Design an enzyme around this catalytic site. Structure first.
Site, PDB file in Angstrom:
ATOM      1  N   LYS A   1      12.632   0.144  -2.009  1.00 46.24           N
ATOM      2  CA  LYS A   1      11.214   0.467  -1.919  1.00 46.24           C
ATOM      3  C   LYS A   1      11.034   1.961  -2.165  1.00 46.24           C
ATOM      4  O   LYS A   1      11.512   2.785  -1.377  1.00 46.24           O
ATOM      5  CB  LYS A   1      10.646   0.069  -0.557  1.00 46.24           C
TER       6      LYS A   1
ATOM      7  N   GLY B   1       0.802  -1.208   0.000  1.00 45.82           N
ATOM      8  CA  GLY B   1       0.000   0.000   0.000  1.00 45.82           C
ATOM      9  C   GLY B   1       0.837   1.261   0.000  1.00 45.82           C
ATOM     10  O   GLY B   1       0.385   2.312  -0.465  1.00 45.82           O
ATOM     11  N   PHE B   2       2.066   1.176   0.501  1.00 42.86           N
ATOM     12  CA  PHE B   2       2.881   2.355   0.740  1.00 42.86           C
ATOM     13  C   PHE B   2       4.010   2.533  -0.266  1.00 42.86           C
ATOM     14  O   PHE B   2       4.673   3.574  -0.242  1.00 42.86           O
ATOM     15  CB  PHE B   2       3.444   2.302   2.165  1.00 42.86           C
ATOM     16  N   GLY B   3       4.242   1.568  -1.145  1.00 39.24           N
ATOM     17  CA  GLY B   3       5.249   1.745  -2.171  1.00 39.24           C
ATOM     18  C   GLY B   3       5.445   0.484  -2.986  1.00 39.24           C
ATOM     19  O   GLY B   3       4.837  -0.559  -2.729  1.00 39.24           O
TER      20      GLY B   3
ATOM     21  N   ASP C   1       1.091  -4.362  11.165  1.00 38.86           N
ATOM     22  CA  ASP C   1       0.825  -4.956   9.851  1.00 38.86           C
ATOM     23  C   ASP C   1       1.474  -6.332   9.726  1.00 38.86           C
ATOM     24  O   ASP C   1       2.130  -6.649   8.733  1.00 38.86           O
ATOM     25  CB  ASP C   1       1.279  -4.046   8.711  1.00 38.86           C
TER      26      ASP C   1
END
Ligand SMILES: CC(C)Oc1nc2nn([C@]34CO[C@](C)(C3)C4)cc2cc1C(=O)Nc1cccn([C@@H]2C[C@@H]2F)c1=O
Length: 287
Positions: A50, A33-35, A144
């Site tokens: 990333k 979701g973040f990269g 997570d």
């Protein structure tokens, strides 16, 4: 202790962030979701880069949050940050390459990898619990925990990854973030506690036992945590769900792992075991 890269350096070593998959001759190995995660080759070393892609200020906060956690969190069972790129519009995190990828892809045998043996599945679960223990012992909440966030090196040592959502450690938040198929009920409501990591690890233990992803669009039950009902409601047994892609799954040890998972997956957070208890139970399974 982290090496500051200029962005153009990372562009050079990632084939200008070729977003094509590795199989298509690109550099993309996966995404979150973040990269997006790219393979890089720096000074004769393969690395994972990333590139972070939520409001922009929050992305920077998560960028630095990974740095702060990584600076103090060094462990065999935690992925190792090598450096970063903060200059330029984009934000980049550079990690040690993990030759065997994610537990998720290895459980699914993605790209033709052989099925994991039960013996290796037990070692991986223990290694992952050792990493989570380090985080909790040093007063961090991962938030997570999932199979995609358990990476495996050449020796299949398990390494917890993605501390962008990590927090220090009752406390609630306006932002509910996580992977819904793994989150505890309290986490879905905005509660932030190390006990939510335990619940998510229980789903991971279930993925390990069954070889099934936590959610599958073309599957019934579509959520893996629901299978804990069929077992307790006597609609099915753990036998019916043990990954058939195994030849060394001793029934006692497998039932031992389901018990650990079941305790981790109690809806009441305070009845869940702590990570040290989870460690102890997992060690007792292989004894
Ligand atoms: C899971 C995806 C996203 O990563 C990888 N997939 C891989 N697949 N294969 C193989 C090789 O032969 C195959 C058949 C294809 C398995 C090797 C891989 C290495 C990685 C990796 O090194 N990935 C990370 C390292 C360090 C950190 N992080 C966190 C996201 C942050 F940066 C990583 O994601």
């Amino acid at each position: 202790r982290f090496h500051s890269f200029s962005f153009y350096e990372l562009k050079n070593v990632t084939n200008n962030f070729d977003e094509r998959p590795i199989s298509v001759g690109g550099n993309k190995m996966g995404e979150g979701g973040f990269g997006v995660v790219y393979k890089g080759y720096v000074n004769n070393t393969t690395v994972a880069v990333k590139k972070l892609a939520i409001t922009t200020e929050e992305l920077k906060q998560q960028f630095d949050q990974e740095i702060k956690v990584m600076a103090k969190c060094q462990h065999e069972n935690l992925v190792e940050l090598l450096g970063f790129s903060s200059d330029g519009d984009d934000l980049c995190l550079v990690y040690v390459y993990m030759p065997n990828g994610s537990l998720l892809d290895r459980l699914s045998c993605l790209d033709g990898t052989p099925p994991l043996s039960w013996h290796m599945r037990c070692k991986i679960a223990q290694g992952a619990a050792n990493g989570i223990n380090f985080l909790h012992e040093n007063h961090h909440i991962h938030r997570d925990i999932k199979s995609a966030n358990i990476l495996l090196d050449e020796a299949f040592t398990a390494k917890i990854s993605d501390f962008g959502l990590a927090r220090a450690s009752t406390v609630m938040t306006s932002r509910i973030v996580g992977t819904t198929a793994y989150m505890a009920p309290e986490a879905l409501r905005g509660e932030i506690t190390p006990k939510s990591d335990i619940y998510s690890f229980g789903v991971v233990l279930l993925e390990i036992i069954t070889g099934l992803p936590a959610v599958d669009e073309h599957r019934e039950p579509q959520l893996l945590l629901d299978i804990k009902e069929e077992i307790e409601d006597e609609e099915k047994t753990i036998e019916d769900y043990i990954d058939k892609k195994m030849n060394d799954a001793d029934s006692t040890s497998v039932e031992a792992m389901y018990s650990v998972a079941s305790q981790c997956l109690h809806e009441k957070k305070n009845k869940r075991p702590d990570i040290k208890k989870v460690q102890q139970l997992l060690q007792e399974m292989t004894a």
